[PDB]
Amino acid sequence: MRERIREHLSSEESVGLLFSGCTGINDKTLGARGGEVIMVTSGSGMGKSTFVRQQALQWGTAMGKKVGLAMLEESVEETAEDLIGLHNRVRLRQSDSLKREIIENGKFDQWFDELFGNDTFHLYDSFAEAETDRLLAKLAYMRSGLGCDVIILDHISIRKMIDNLMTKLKGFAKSTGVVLVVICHLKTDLRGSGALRQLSDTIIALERNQLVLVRILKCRFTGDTGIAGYMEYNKETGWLEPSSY
Amino acid sequence: MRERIREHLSSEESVGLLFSGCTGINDKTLGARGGEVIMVTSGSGMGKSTFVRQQALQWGTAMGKKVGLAMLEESVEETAEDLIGLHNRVRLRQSDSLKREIIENGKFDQWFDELFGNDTFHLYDSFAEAETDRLLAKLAYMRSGLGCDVIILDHISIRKMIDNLMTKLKGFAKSTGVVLVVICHLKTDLRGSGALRQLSDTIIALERNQLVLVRILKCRFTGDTGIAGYMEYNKETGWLEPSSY
Amino acid sequence: MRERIREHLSSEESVGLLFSGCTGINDKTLGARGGEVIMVTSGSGMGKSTFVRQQALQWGTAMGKKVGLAMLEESVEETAEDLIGLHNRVRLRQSDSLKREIIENGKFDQWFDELFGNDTFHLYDSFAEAETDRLLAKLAYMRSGLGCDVIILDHISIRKMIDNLMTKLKGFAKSTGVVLVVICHLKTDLRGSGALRQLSDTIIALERNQLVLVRILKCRFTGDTGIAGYMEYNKETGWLEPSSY
Amino acid sequence: MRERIREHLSSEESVGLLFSGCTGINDKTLGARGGEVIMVTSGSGMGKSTFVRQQALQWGTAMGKKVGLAMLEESVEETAEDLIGLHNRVRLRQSDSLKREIIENGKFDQWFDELFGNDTFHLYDSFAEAETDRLLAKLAYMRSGLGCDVIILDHISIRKMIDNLMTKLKGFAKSTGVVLVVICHLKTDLRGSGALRQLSDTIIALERNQLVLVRILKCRFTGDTGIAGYMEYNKETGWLEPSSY
Amino acid sequence: MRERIREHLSSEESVGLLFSGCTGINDKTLGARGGEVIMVTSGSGMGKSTFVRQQALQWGTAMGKKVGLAMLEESVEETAEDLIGLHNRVRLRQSDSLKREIIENGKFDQWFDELFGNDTFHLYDSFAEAETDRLLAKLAYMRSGLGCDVIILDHISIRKMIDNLMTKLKGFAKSTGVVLVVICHLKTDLRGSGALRQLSDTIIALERNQLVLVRILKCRFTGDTGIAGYMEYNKETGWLEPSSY
Amino acid sequence: MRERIREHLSSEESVGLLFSGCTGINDKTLGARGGEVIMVTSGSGMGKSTFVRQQALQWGTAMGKKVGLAMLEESVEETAEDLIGLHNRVRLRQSDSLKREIIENGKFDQWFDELFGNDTFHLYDSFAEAETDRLLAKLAYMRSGLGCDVIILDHISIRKMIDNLMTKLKGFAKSTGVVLVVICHLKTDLRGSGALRQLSDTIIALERNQLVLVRILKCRFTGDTGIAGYMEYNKETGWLEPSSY
Numbered sequence A, B, C, D, E, F: 001m002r003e004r005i006r007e008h009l010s011s012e013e014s015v016g017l018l019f020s021g022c023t024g025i026n027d028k029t030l031g032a033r034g035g036e037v038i039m040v041t042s043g044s045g046m047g048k049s050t051f052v053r054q055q056a057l058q059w060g061t062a063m064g065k066k067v068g069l070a071m072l073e074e075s076v077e078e079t080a081e082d083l084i085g086l087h088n089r090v091r092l093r094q095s096d097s098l099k100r101e102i103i104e105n106g107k108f109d110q111w112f113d114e115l116f117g118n119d120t121f122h123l124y125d126s127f128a129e130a131e132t133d134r135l136l137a138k139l140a141y142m143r144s145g146l147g148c149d150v151i152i153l154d155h156i157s158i159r160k161m162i163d164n165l166m167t168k169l170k171g172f173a174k175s176t177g178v179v180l181v182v183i184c185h186l187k188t189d190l191r192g193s194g195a196l197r198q199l200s201d202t203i204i205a206l207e208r209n210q211l212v213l214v215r216i217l218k219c220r221f222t223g224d225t226g227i228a229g230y231m232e233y234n235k236e237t238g239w240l241e242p243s244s245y
């Protein structure tokens, strides 16, 4: 047992992929570990995607990880546009001028390669179809075929479709060891559903004004729950910034 | 993806129909885009119609757009009287004298043609009936038949009638691409209802003394919320003017 | 529409029954129109009845209108005594001498006929009962049977009794087209209640020393709010006079 | 109505019990009428009791009225001593000599009968208890049993005790028609309380040096407010005298 | 009978193994007696294992008892890691640093012997198989072969598998006299099942925030039910502490 | 018939052995009559034995009756321990201290004689065997040989064993005239079985929290059914007390 415990002790990965922008989030969660399902939820337009996109950007950019992004709702161009702006600390969607200037400028192309030139980000859309298996098959490919370290499922809104999917999702993450982050629409802990709350390893909720409050609704590994801290959205750069609240 | 993003970038219309009279409204919203539902709300007699009528006037007059106006509460003559006065910076309803003077003067007729002579404004009333489909059918006609760029629904007060209508309205706007502005009576964000808040793309609220404060309660496209600025109602011209508050 | 607007323009009555004694009141309200409910409120003993009685006197006396007066609190003799004095610029209630002198003098009778001789004023009391319908039935009779142009309800103090009554009152005024002035006891805009503020077309508030300030809390038709002006109560004649404040 | 108004006119009592010592008080109030509650207030030691006692003396002495005096704070002997001195234009309480001289002199007894010999004054004390009903029952007896025309409640200082009492007091005065004068301690109009200000028909306030200023804070019947005049306290006779201020 | 009762009285063990960390738990239960089945239940991640592990630690450490721990879900290394940390008031699983530091430090080995050096704790895993008898045979061995005073079954979630097992478990405890604590997952009293509630001698439920509330759902021996008290989880030491709620 | 009815009237015993601790139980049942079978049922650990033991104590102690107690489940020492504690308003089983203190104290012996010194209570156990006749023979002996007035059968849980036994029990009670109280385990009226419900003359059910509610499910003699009242268990004395629910 002794030797058995020892190697067990020296082989265990407690700290996963560290989160960014929110001082305290890593304290209460110790980052994202492989095989876990992170659920990021909140009200519509409350900043779910931004937050996740930001994590994706850092992970694939600074942590040198391969990030797959599966979009159920929006298109790849939309997602790409968002990452490019984010990466360049500008909001392409808000500036008809910038979009136009950047294309003739040659900065678009320069920006495109400086981000997707490498084999780091894998964006997939067209899952418009309500079939889970079709979805799991693509996810499994992103993992195995493209070697994605992290897979972001954007998004899901609260039957078996969700129940069974959540159970399939959790199964896929646990067996492969990839980090699966799922974005779910909440229209508190109960605000979700059975499997949603149950299968998810860590649940993060963003709250706003009615500055974003980052609440850790659940973290199996750590058990440390409560509010991790606050973030301040930069309307000019589109980045969620750490706050002094 | 590259070419896919590029054309996507160069084909996207971020800035819609610009609003008028309130310095800052366009900052936080970037105007009214086609396919979106703009909700303008506030207390009764707080200036909702005036504000909307003003936007209508400029859109159809200066922006060279076709504006359809569907009145649920008041008559076409009433609406026409309002636009004519507005257009002529006078308040016809307040002056028994002006009304009388303008008719024999010949200015009425001159005013009438100089405004409705063209095929720009389309006023429709008699929707007194509480039937949605009867209403949607007329709206669809204003869009297709009369080629209206903007449709103003005046008005609605806070069931399914509103819920289902809001969902029908939003469906009609999104599929056709017309700009649908709806005026709703509020007797804050919650001050409305589910679909009311949910389906509406941009929600504008006017506040007064208890000078009008223009608050942007919600803007999906931009996410930029808060107070856009102030306006000053001209009791002599009936126009809401930009303020130096 | 053109012809439709025209006749609409030449048929609309913007200026109603003009008020008296307060320079500016007509500016911000354009008088009292038929079908509207005018609410006159203020603190107890602040001059509500006097003000209304004065308007009644002029309307029925100079404007050649038929005025019905329904008193909930006081008796007809009391009301008559007040009008007679007012009409004769003397305060009967304050002078035991005058009352006595006028009766033997023969001036009482001369005063009585010179005021009520004609079919212009209709005073009704004994509504001591808290039943609305009993009240509405009498009002409707004053309108139809006695052809009253203006009906003054004196008085009401701030449930459904008031809520439902206000809604019944407003219904009666709107459908008949009579001018209904209601006197309400306030123990600002909120100082009242839902229907009270809501159904009332124009709300006038009198303010005193803690010379009477005439504040226009609300005017649907005009929207012109604020203080209309000042009046000076004549302790010798009992008349509220226009001031030079 | 005519005959109805006439008799109404010839039966109405405008002028009540006239006040004394202050030239102008009767002008702005027309005296004390039966069924009304007169409130006399001011700072402690400002001359409230003296003023009231003086009115009592004249009413019961010259006006040939029956005056009941209910003392909550002091004793009957104290009150009697005060009236006797007042009546004899001397201050018994200030002169150990006079008190002693008057008793052996035989003037005490002569003074006692010449004042209380008759059935005009009714002094009652021992209401030390904070029970209203116990108090109302005594008051009602003074009215009915002893036929008191005027009842003076001395005193009250500013809950429901006061609120409910004021409402009970006003009820008792209105239904019986007695004149009820209440002395209240003020530690302006607001200086009192709800019912205090509300139920009281006439409110008199005495002001001094920081010669007594007599201010009429409120008079329902007349509406005539403001300062009625000035009085000059005679430190030798204890009488408040009319002034030439 | 007398002598029969006497010795009966002087031979009966009312107070069993005292619990720790929760002031009041022993009051309502009088500890854990041999032959009884203690059921500790609550929601997943609510602190069941910690609580039980803590009791185990004290029993085997301070009470000088032999504690067998049978883990159905997790491994021995995991369990050992937990006890070692607990014993050393540190959370090994949360600190990649501590784990690493402790191994080279030599503190691991020192910690290992200072806890398992003796023959006090007996950890057994690999019961992954759903066979009861295979399970009962191991338990019986832990009792007889290893002389375990207390056996902790971790864990069971709510057929006959549970029904029959619960009946086998209770049979084993009653006949041997060992103290059997079973941890069951609850997804109130009914929240369990027939045998679960029936065979269990004492049922403890932990409740948290939607500080841990310790509720005694059932205690045959004592009958004393209700909430025993509160505990406060120390996120730094991993120990559940007694509270001042 | 007359004389026949008369003596019949004057010889009939309507009121039996009165129950204790529950205000109302005697109202709806009129006590326990000889020849009747009282069934006391409820959930396990719901207080059946306590309740019955209490009745036994009072009957044999205060009513001067001879009470036989036949225990099927537990031993005589256990039963004796319970009665002694009950009799001394202490819970011997819960206090290892008291048990020990009382024995050396000499209070045990004093307690033993002061309760069983006399020939009032007859406790019999060892009926562990499932034979009815063996059981009936002992019961018959307790009646005839020991002259027991009341016999308590503790206990029975819900075939013919119960059916035939219930029929034998009822036969024994009816023919001898003893009062037979039987305690049955219920795992409403139907909650039992044929003979159980049928042969039993009076059925009492205790209900608790999911303070004990005493429900009279059946009373042949009286027919008066429903809830008799409430009792409050004293965790310190072990006595069920009458409540103020």
Ligand SMILES: Cc1cn([C@H]2C[C@H](O)[C@@H](COP(=O)(O)OP(=O)(O)OP(=O)(O)O)O2)c(=O)[nH]c1=O
Pocket (backbone or CB within 6 Å): A042, A043, A044, A045, A046, A047, A048, A049, A050, A051, A155, A185, A211, A212, A233, A234, A235, B220, B221, B222, B223, B224, B225
């Ligand atoms: C957090 C935040 C978001 N936003 C904007 C950016 C986007 O245009 C918009 C939505 O942000 P998202 O990140 O898309 O929010 P969401 O993912 O919760 O929304 P949905 O229900 O649509 O999936 O709001 C702000 O303008 N300010 C802010 O502080």
Ligand SMILES: Cc1cn([C@H]2C[C@H](O)[C@@H](COP(=O)(O)OP(=O)(O)OP(=O)(O)O)O2)c(=O)[nH]c1=O
Pocket (backbone or CB within 6 Å): B042, B043, B044, B045, B046, B047, B048, B049, B050, B051, B155, B185, B211, B212, B233, B234, B235, C220, C221, C222, C223, C224, C225
């Ligand atoms: C904003 C404003 C309005 N108004 C007047 C103009 C109109 O006669 C009246 C109502 O303005 P509207 O524009 O009709 O206000 P609304 O649409 O919120 O009202 P409703 O509940 O009746 O639909 O108020 C002013 O007088 N001053 C002002 O500053």
Ligand SMILES: Cc1cn([C@H]2C[C@H](O)[C@@H](COP(=O)(O)OP(=O)(O)OP(=O)(O)O)O2)c(=O)[nH]c1=O
Pocket (backbone or CB within 6 Å): C042, C043, C044, C045, C046, C047, C048, C049, C050, C051, C155, C185, C211, C212, C233, C234, C235, D220, D221, D222, D223, D224, D225
């Ligand atoms: C305005 C005014 C009123 N008054 C007097 C006239 C009346 O006797 C008395 C009340 O005037 P009212 O016109 O009766 O005042 P009101 O209608 O607000 O009162 P209520 O609560 O009793 O219904 O006040 C003055 O003496 N001076 C003034 O300046």
Ligand SMILES: Cc1cn([C@H]2C[C@H](O)[C@@H](COP(=O)(O)OP(=O)(O)OP(=O)(O)O)O2)c(=O)[nH]c1=O
Pocket (backbone or CB within 6 Å): D042, D043, D044, D045, D046, D047, D048, D049, D050, D051, D155, D185, D211, D212, D233, D234, D235
């Ligand atoms: C008015 C006045 C009163 N006084 C004296 C007479 C009395 O001894 C004393 C109080 O007069 P009071 O009439 O008792 O005054 P008050 O009723 O307001 O007082 P309290 O709070 O005690 O009830 O003051 C003067 O000496 N000079 C004056 O000018």
Ligand SMILES: Cc1cn([C@H]2C[C@H](O)[C@@H](COP(=O)(O)OP(=O)(O)OP(=O)(O)O)O2)c(=O)[nH]c1=O
Pocket (backbone or CB within 6 Å): A220, A221, A222, A223, A224, A225, E042, E043, E044, E045, E046, E047, E048, E049, E050, E051, E155, E185, E211, E212, E233, E234, E235
């Ligand atoms: C009670 C408590 C537990 N925890 C953590 C410690 C662990 O990592 C995690 C689970 O505690 P456990 O003791 O494992 O809870 P459990 O046994 O009820 O759970 P399961 O369903 O998984 O068998 O929660 C806290 O972080 N804070 C607390 O206050």
Ligand SMILES: Cc1cn([C@H]2C[C@H](O)[C@@H](COP(=O)(O)OP(=O)(O)OP(=O)(O)O)O2)c(=O)[nH]c1=O
Pocket (backbone or CB within 6 Å): E220, E221, E222, E223, E224, E225, F042, F043, F044, F045, F046, F047, F048, F049, F050, F051, F155, F185, F211, F212, F233, F234, F235
């Ligand atoms: C009624 C009651 C019982 N008890 C306890 C006393 C005993 O130790 C235990 C059982 O009471 P019993 O009187 O034995 O209950 P029962 O006869 O229905 O049970 P069984 O199925 O075991 O035959 O419960 C309380 O602690 N509180 C109470 O309020």
